[PDB]
Design a protein around this ligand. Structure first.
Ligand SMILES: NC(=O)C1=CN([C@@H]2O[C@H](COP(=O)(O)OP(=O)(O)OC[C@H]3O[C@@H](n4cnc5c(N)ncnc54)[C@H](OP(=O)(O)O)[C@@H]3O)[C@@H](O)[C@H]2O)C=CC1
Ligand SMILES: NC(=O)C1=CN([C@@H]2O[C@H](COP(=O)(O)OP(=O)(O)OC[C@H]3O[C@@H](n4cnc5c(N)ncnc54)[C@H](OP(=O)(O)O)[C@@H]3O)[C@@H](O)[C@H]2O)C=CC1
Ligand SMILES: [Cl-]
Ligand SMILES: [Cl-]
Ligand SMILES: [Mn+2]
Ligand SMILES: [Mn+2]
Lengths: 402, 402
């Protein structure tokens, strides 16, 4: 009657509305049906502040040992959060700490649900975007000048052979701006690996965008290392399984994203992934329908969380005792996803089928007219909606019936 | 009775299929309703070759002098064309030479036709992407290194005052890639100016996008200069005209692009301009429906042309006698756009309304059914299309009734 989960699931608790909602998932939709070993780590801001953020390093190393992480959305501290919670220091983003201890690439996977319209009716399958987790603009040296002068870019070899000096330009009277940015071959290779691993697992084809027509050397390495990694360690499984890999120019790929139906993993350079991810998420109308999804190169370790944050605005409402309409879908799909990989490693098809059934019940509940406000308004103003508890209860029943 | 155009309209002839349609347009829709002095410059490949491209300089200085140009699509030489046409040398893009003589910014204006579907149905009004004409990735220095080493980026002021030496990074054992790029304050102010004059003359509010959360100095200048320029030169007028300017993050602007209805000018940095234009054009389905549209900073000079090329595959057909279904909408609109501004500078309202009437008459003509194959399959696997003269016959006729 309770399906036995074999290995552990690391559970990373979090903050505000998602913490409220995250417990109700665990108690109504996980814990009834599963006898399961949950390795718990409270990454709620209080408990990170109370351990000076060690709990986060612990949480990461636990994910790393056991291969599965399911995570509630968490507050990233800033000057306002420092005052609100009386933080001892401004603790760094926990995602950053986990990314960094785990390595691996973040993938944004949307959830398609027939009667919830996307802003591009053509879409029909999930468009997954994987975003190089390292480098380019996000590590840039950039600065301004209010005056004339010349700009030089030098590579100094570590073996002491001659510097390679590039004379870039002369900036005129009124000054301007200057920026230098880089990436690593190792990182680039590691980016392709996770990408192919992710596409293999989902059985989606894979695309790389670059702008190698303009940056021949810089983006040539993205193209070259993607093709090497594909050929050496991925091509035979791809072919193989009907799957494919291509490089396309970024200009083609953004048009393609708009035109195609979905069903592929688009690997983007760091900046492209930050931007495109926001085009695709907008398409689906609501972040309650978006997961992400850290997968390692190999791809043995997965960590899943809702792509949205902690829904402070809803939390302020719940705190007053007022009603809320918070979408639980991504959070649930974070859990279902973690369980998926867990039974994969386990290899206990029952945990997997439970994952999938849960998923289907959810899709089925909404394809019925039972939904939270963020979905309803996508449909129309005629469409009424469920408050957060109501929506989870609905799921819970529709799930009970099987 | 024919409408009297005051000043001269500089006309720039072009290539292949577009050259043909372009005469039909002149002869059927323009000359026979207007009393216009065309200062004519033939930019078909042959005459460019016969003048060693001087004609291109002459056309550009003509536009400078007279404030108005309308231009047929032209061939940009590469290796195949050098052979096809026996070119004496590989002449540079006449668009790039025009741009550089005139300065200014390129605006992509799509033509939104009620009965032609756009892949994003919520779009009821044109999204106008203005692209910075200069710098960033398009002038970068970029290289790969297959070894470890350090990267320094240095501004050496003309002064002889201390060079500012930034130590960017050490690249690990397997090497990596490095880029340096820049832009000029003087260029950035100009880009703001044409962006403002453009949005005012289209009666559209104006948005800029940057990523200044990450590139605080580099994009800091784009936002700061755009804002200065804005308050010091356009806010009075803008406010008076019921119009508004905002900076937004690129992540928000791509989201707004999909969800908003349209009806704004979107000033993108060079790269984001390159890319977002392709998302917008794909949404509209056909470059038959797209113009670009150079406006100078001040903004007394305008030069328009269709955003598509010379439509070679069609020409091959027309050379061989078979029928062609080439959309002249964007070209007619290049003419209508130019008359508008010629009408404006003069200032002679009958010119303007004519421009307007011809436009609405083209739209109305497609609204009644009757369209090139082009637009046809935006609509359905069967929607019946006219061939090139057949549809442009129809427009001649329709315009007639008024
Ligand atoms: N741990 C993580 O992965 C992330 C954490 N964050 C953090 O969360 C905090 C607050 O984030 P913020 O971006 O402001 O807000 P959210 O992304 O959490 O949500 C913003 C708005 O989007 C809507 N929304 C988001 N998710 C849902 C949902 N599941 N169901 C219904 N509506 C939803 C709501 O609309 P409306 O108000 O109109 O009802 C909400 O107010 C910050 O501290 C930030 O650091 C942010 C991103 C990721
Ligand atoms: N001066 C300028 O503004 C520009 C000039 N060019 C030049 O144009 C030349 C041809 O380039 P190329 O990109 O291959 O051809 P085009 O870019 O002009 O058009 C390519 C295809 O798009 C479709 N298409 C574009 N315009 C129309 C239209 N008005 N009506 C119907 N279909 C249309 C056709 O589809 P289908 O094949 O299915 O019929 C056509 O084959 C090149 O020499 C290039 O240098 C390119 C861009 C700009
Ligand atoms: Cl980084
Ligand atoms: Cl340039
Ligand atoms: Mn983003
Ligand atoms: Mn482009």
């Amino acid at each position: 009657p309770k399906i036995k989960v074999s290995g552990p699931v690391v559970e990373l608790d979090g903050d505000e509305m998602t913490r409220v909602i995250w417990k109700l998932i665990k108690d109504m939709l996980i814990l009834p049906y599963l006898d399961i070993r949950l390795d718990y780590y409270d990454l709620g801001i209080e408990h990170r502040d109370a351990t000076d953020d060690q709990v986060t390093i612990d949480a990461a190393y636990a994910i790393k040992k056991h291969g599965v992480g399911v995570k509630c959305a968490t507050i990233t501290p800033d000057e306002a959060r420092v005052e609100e919670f009386n933080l001892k220091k401004m603790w760094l983003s926990p995602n950053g700490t986990i990314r960094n201890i785990l390595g691996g690439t973040i993938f944004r996977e949307p959830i398609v649900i027939s009667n919830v319209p996307r802003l591009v009716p053509g879409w029909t399958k999930p468009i997954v975007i994987g975003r190089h987790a390292f480098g380019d603009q996000y590590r840039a040296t950039n600065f301004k000048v209010d005056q004339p002068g010349t700009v030089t870019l030098t590579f100094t070899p570590a073996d002491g052979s001659a510097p390679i000096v590039h004379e870039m330009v002369s900036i005129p009277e009124d000054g301007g701006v200057v920026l230098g940015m880089y990436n690593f071959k190792e990182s680039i290779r590691d980016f392709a690996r996770a990408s192919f691993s992710y596409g293999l697992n989902a059985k989606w084809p894979v695309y790389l965008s670059t702008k190698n027509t303009i940056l021949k050397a810089y983006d040539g390495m993205f193209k070259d290392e993607f093709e090497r990694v594909y050929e050496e360690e991925f091509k035979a499984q791809f072919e193989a399984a009907g799957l494919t890999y291509e490089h396309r120019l970024i200009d083609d790929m953004v048009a393609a994203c708009l035109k195609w139906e979905g069903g592929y993993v688009w690997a983007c350079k760091n900046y492209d992934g930050d931007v495109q991810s926001d085009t695709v998420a907008q398409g689906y109308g609501s972040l309650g329908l978006m997961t992400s999804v850290l997968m390692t190169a190999d791809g043995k370790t997965v960590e899943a969380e809702a792509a949205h944050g902690t829904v402070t605005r809803h939390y302020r409402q719940y705190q007053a005792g007022k009603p809320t309409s918070t979408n639980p879908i991504a959070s649930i799909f974070a859990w279902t996803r973690g369980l998926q990989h867990r039974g994969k490693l386990d290899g206990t098809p029952e945990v997997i089928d439970f994952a999938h059934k849960l998923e289907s019940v959810v899709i089925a509940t909404v394809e019925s007219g039972k939904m939270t406000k963020d979905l309803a308004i996508l449909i129309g103003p005629e469409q009424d909606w469920l408050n957060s508890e109501e929506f989870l209860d609905a799921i819970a029943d529709n799930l009970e019936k099987e």
